[PDB]
């Protein structure tokens, strides 16, 4: 997250870290057994880390649970990032509590102009590199489809939305991929892609979770 703020320990209790020996992507807990992330975050060997604030210090509220199964969307295209969504099943159910909590899936799709909360442990620099240990947060508005398409001609599908600031300075970034975009208390987006981070005229692009609620619900009813 570039241009964000320190969230505050466990104030984003649905945020997970995906770990393969190191943090490599975010995700969102949607019930005690399942995480939603980006398909481009797929790796074998994932441990889900819940209740994290500093990902380099064991602070006392964490639950570390191995994934049993990952399910990349059936129509995921890694070239375009169309359908950039994945489900991860945990080997055992998380214990839900004040610091480890699920986020609601949407009923309706979010509205252009709505301010959403994006979070993660990704890079905090637009130019260069610096990875935080504690979770960072950013409030960012959803941009109109027309503005999104104009920023990324020939690249935006109806399964994507842009959010952020066209002047630059504030965005998600590498290492935030797979994490939540929460708008009116529901998971509306997944950190997916963008050209650089926090550059002018190059807002973040996010998987449009409202398009996937029927796939999510039938998949979790079946696995
Ligand atoms: Ca920790």
Swiss-Prot record:
Record-annotated disulphide pairs: 7-137, 25-41, 109-210, 116-183, 148-162, 173-197
Pfam family, one: Trypsin
Entry keyword annotation includes Secreted: yes
Locations listed in the record: Secreted, Extracellular space
Record keywords: Calcium, Digestion, Disulfide bond, Hydrolase, Metal-binding, Protease, Secreted, Serine protease, Signal, Zymogen
Tissue specificity of this protein: Synthesized in the acinar cells of the pancreas.
Active site, UniProt feature: 40 (charge relay system), 84 (charge relay system), 177 (charge relay system)
InterPro entries (alphabetical): Peptidase_S1_PA, Peptidase_S1_PA_chymotrypsin, Peptidase_S1A, Serine_Proteases_S1, Trypsin_dom, TRYPSIN_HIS, TRYPSIN_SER
EC assignment: 3.4.21.4
Chief location: secreted
Binding site for substrate: 171-172, 174-175, 177
Post-translational modification: Subsequent cleavage after Lys-125 leads to alpha-trypsin. Further cleavage after Lys-170 yields pseudotrypsin. A cleavage may also occur after Arg-99.
Cofactor(s) this protein cannot do without: Ca(2+)
Record comment: activity regulation: Is inhibited by scorpion cyclotide trypsin inhibitor TopI1.
Occurrences of domain Peptidase S1 (ranges): 1-221
Record's catalysed reaction(s): Preferential cleavage: Arg-|-Xaa, Lys-|-Xaa
Cofactor binding, note field: Binds 1 Ca(2+) ion per subunit.
GO biological process per UniProt: digestion; proteolysis
CDD domains registered for this protein in UniProt: Tryp_SPc
Family: Belongs to the peptidase S1 family.
Protein name in UniProt: Serine protease 1
Species whose genome carries this gene: Bos taurus (Bovine)
Gene: PRSS1
